Structures are given as C-alpha cells and as structure tokens.
Design a protein around this nucleic acid. Structure first.
Lengths: 64, 155, 114
RNA sequence: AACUUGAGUGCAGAAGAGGAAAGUGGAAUUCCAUGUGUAGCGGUGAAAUGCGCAGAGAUAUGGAGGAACACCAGUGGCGAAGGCGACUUUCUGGUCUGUAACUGACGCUGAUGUGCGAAAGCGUGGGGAUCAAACAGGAUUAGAUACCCUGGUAGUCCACGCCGUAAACGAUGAGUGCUAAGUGUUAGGGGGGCCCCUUAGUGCUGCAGCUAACGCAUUAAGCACUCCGCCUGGGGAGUA
C-alpha cells in the first residue's frame, strides 16, 4: 500500500509535526513496522529519526 | 487397547433376587471355576444379613455397594523425574467393578469362621460406613482430594 | 479503606505471588502459592494460583475492599486462573494491565541452560 | 606527433549503523534509605545449597552508580577487511547517478616494505551495574575436578600503549572484456498512480558451458588476457 510520503508529496518529515507522527506510533509509542504502514524504505528512516527526536523533546511518549 | 473398544461379556439376572450385580458377585467369589460354592456363599450371606439388620437382603446390599463404589480415582501421568498422579473421575461401569472387588477382597482378609459369615459381616459393615471395603474408597478419595493440582493433566 | 486497592500478581514458572495493596502502594495482605503448602510443580499450577489469589482476597475484605486493579508481572501459567479467582470472590476487577518489565536493552541476560 | 572510450578532474544531484570527539535522553538491572507488609523467597526432573524471620520476597517513593541502546529492523544500508544500530552538534573518509566542461593512457597487479586488523590476553591509571572463566559449595552418577542449581574473582567498560592471532569463510586473490533468460529489493536517471527503458549494488531460480560429484552459472566455480600468493602422499610436526 501507498506511502503517504510519496503520495502527498512530503519531502521533509518534521519532528515538530507531532500530529503527523502519531499515525505511526501505535499504542505504546512503538514505531510501527513499514509493512504495516506501507511507507517506503526511504521514508521509514527519516520518520524514525523524527519520532526519536520528538521523544527526546517530550513531544511523543517513549512508552504508553 | 489401540484399536477402538472391546465389547464386554454380559451377565444374566440373579436366579433369586433378579440382580445382575448379585450374579457378578458370585463371579468374584468363584475360585477355580467352582460355581456351586460361590452361589452358596452369597445366598448363605444374603439370607444372613437379613437376620442381622432386619431389612431386605437386596436392600442392604444396594446400600452397601453405594458405600464402596469410588467416585474419583487417581491415574498416573509422567513428566520426568516426577510421576504425576492425575485424579480421574471413575466411569460408572468401573465403579461397580471396584465396589464388588473391594467387598470380596476385604471380606477374605477378615475372619471369624468361614467365608459366608465374613461376607455377611462385611456387607453389613459397608452399609454402616465401616470396614476395609469403605476404608479403601476413603483412601481412594483422599488421594484424589490431595492431587487436585494435577487435575488439568488429564491427557 | 473502602475500595481502590490494586492487586499485583507475579505469575512465573514457579509460585504465583499475589499481593493486595492500597492505591498508594501500601501492602494490606499477600498470599503466594508457596504459602499454601504447595510443593514444587504444584506451585506453578492454575489450581494453586486459584487458592493463592482468593486466600489474599479474603484478607482484603476485612479492610473493606470493593475495587481491585490487577497488575500482572510475569509470564507464568497461573495468570488467568488468578484473575478469575478474584472475581469468584467478588472483588470487582476493573483493569487488566500487564507490567512485565521490558528492558530497552542495557543488561546482559543470564546465560541460558544447556 | 594525434585521439578519447580507460583512468582521473570539473558541474548538477543521491543514499548510507563509514570513522573520531564532545554532549543529551528513556526503559531496564543492581545497591542504598524509608512507608506498608508477613513466613516464606528462590530453584529443579526431583532436590538441596542459598537468601529470611535481626523482617526477607512483594509493593510505593526517592537516591547512587555502571553498562547497553526495545519498537524502527529487513537475504536492509555502509566500510578494504575486522566490523558499524538511542538522539544532537563539530571535524572527516569513501561510494553511486546524470552531464560531457577539462588532461589525453596519467592504467593493472604488486615481492620486500609500511599500516589497519574480532574476541581473548598483558602493562599503567581509572571504573565496576549485569553476566561471568577460574573458586566455593549443593545435587546426578558406580565415580562427575562436567552438563543442573546457588554464589562468585579476573575479565567484560574507559584512556593510553602492547599483542597481531580466528571456521579473520563466499572455506572462492586483484584488474579487464565476452557469453540465454525469469523474477525480486536498495539507491538514482530518462521517457510514455501504472508501463517501458536504463546505471550501480544486493537476493532466489535457471540456459549454454564447467565439475569427480555436490554444485556454479552476467555477484561463475564458463570463455579469454596481465600480475601476485600458495601446493606436490599421511604421520613425525607447525615439532625441533
């Protein structure tokens, strides 16, 4: 299935955009596997970086 | 065994009291194919317990059998160095086989003069919740009571 | 108290320690499968956990407990029987949360058997 | 003397756990101090040693310290190899794609040499949570200086040096070109979300061809050319 990062054209995932990130953190803040979310390999990496930056800045929970 | 189940050999009702249970008790008393004695052993005891208790010979016997028949047995499982004693409820058919067997065996183990009086003595004691026959089931229940922790290991 | 006393259940491959404490972490009573006279290979059984839970549950009712939060810590066989041993005593289980600690690495797991 | 395709440089792009330094985090383990709390905890196939009743285990809060970075995470990526996974910043290496702006063979291999090189090990000085060689027990066995359990020292961590060995393996040297296909995945490019073409990696089947066979097969173990290293029955012996 579709990436949502290629479909909508997002070329820079921002760690300040918590609302966009909460779609990939499941019920614990656990990063969802890209098979489940269908994002490509290129965007699974910059999304993981954004999520980990948000966790450090307390914009996203480490565990929930 | 491995292949299905084995049909069992059936008995006919007793000549006097008309009870298949009574005839099978004769089959237990019998040694070396001697039916004659075994038939005389029971009728000399059924008619004897009537003089002791007072009620019907078959009525006391039915009461006594109920007080010998076991309700929960203990079959053995195995995990390794520990042997699992798994309590298994006794199927109705095995209960009668065990109750009749325990009546004869714990009558033979006693003694006053002869077998007829021993059988009659054990019959009345069983209806009174006394004797070795009822002490065997009390231990059979006790082992089933203790090992309830192994109940879910019933194969 | 009146209600809201959390119950922590430690179900392992050995006995299941069940302890009932208030909402603020003050132990009221506790009862493990080993405190009920259970021998090994009896300790980690659903039957033993059944009595293990309710034995501490009765001691809770004396302080007047009407609400329990079940915090289960451990992968043990005597977990579900323990929880149904609390409702059977009428403790009104509200939540079932698993708190089995998950390290984010950071420790060397003890060597496995051979 | 001349030429660009080889090799490099220029320009426009791409991805990456490539390396070094310094910082910042969350989970967890251990220990410590308290509050609650009561007779067990722990472990096995069964035990017991062992820790407890001088209040253990559990539970709640707080503190100290060390180490490693769940989810992401994959026949995924990077590196010459060994190896490299928390995040941020600073230095810094390599690779790929496209273009064709420049040089016009400036290339390959490479004895000796010179560096890097997993773990374990050594020296110096720190640090020491966890796991632990060895050591102590407790068991099993006929015996058990072993597998099982209970602890436990060096080490495991850091900074400098030394060591220079691994089934350091794709058990497959480096470079170049040619030789059926099918279907994936990673990072780009050009055309008409889809299709086609294409470059470089990484996979699985599979032709010719090769092999003793297993099998390899455009990431050869096929067909060719250049250079280096290595072998000539098994022990004795990687021993003098």
């Amino acid at each position: 299935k579709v990436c949502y990062f290629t479909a909508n054209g997002i070329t820079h995932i921002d760690y300040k955009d918590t609302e966009l990130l909460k779609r990939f953190i499941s019920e614990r803040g656990k990063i969802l596997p890209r098979r489940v979310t269908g994002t490509s390999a290129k965007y699974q990496r910059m999304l993981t970086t954004a999520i980990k930056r948000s966790r450090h800045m307390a914009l996203l929970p480490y565990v929930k | 065994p491995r292949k299905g189940s084995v049909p069992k050999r059936d008995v006919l009702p007793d000549p006097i009291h008309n009870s298949k249970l009574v005839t099978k008790l004769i089959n237990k008393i019998m040694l070396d194919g001697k039916r004659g004695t075994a038939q005389r052993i029971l009728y000399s005891a059924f008619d004897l317990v009537e003089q002791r208790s007072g009620r019907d010979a078959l009525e006391v016997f039915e009461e006594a059998i109920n007080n010998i028949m076991p309700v929960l047995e203990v079959k053995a499982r195995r995990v390794g160095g520990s042997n699992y004693q798994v309590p298994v409820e006794v199927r109705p058919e095995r209960r009668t086989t065990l109750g009749l067997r325990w009546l004869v065996n714990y009558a033979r183990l006693r003694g006053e003069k002869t077998m007829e009086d021993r059988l009659a003595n054990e019959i009345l004691d069983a209806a009174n919740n006394t004797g070795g026959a009822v002490k065997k089931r009390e231990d059979t229940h006790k082992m089933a009571e203790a090992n309830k922790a192994f109940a879910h290991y019933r194969w | 108290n009146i209600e809201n006393g959390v119950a922590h259940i430690r179900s392992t491959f050995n006995n299941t320690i069940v302890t009932i404490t208030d909402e603020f972490g003050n132990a009221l009573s506790w009862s493990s499968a080993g405190a009920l006279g259970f021998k090994g290979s009896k300790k980690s059984t659903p039957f033993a956990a059944q009595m293990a839970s309710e034995t501490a549950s009765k001691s809770a009712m004396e302080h007047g407990l009407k609400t329990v939060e079940v915090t289960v810590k451990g992968p043990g066989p005597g977990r579900e029987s323990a929880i149904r041993a609390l409702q059977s005593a009428g403790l009104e289980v509200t939540a079932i949360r698993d708190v089995t600690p998950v390290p984010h690495n950071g420790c060397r797991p003890p060597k496995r058997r051979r």
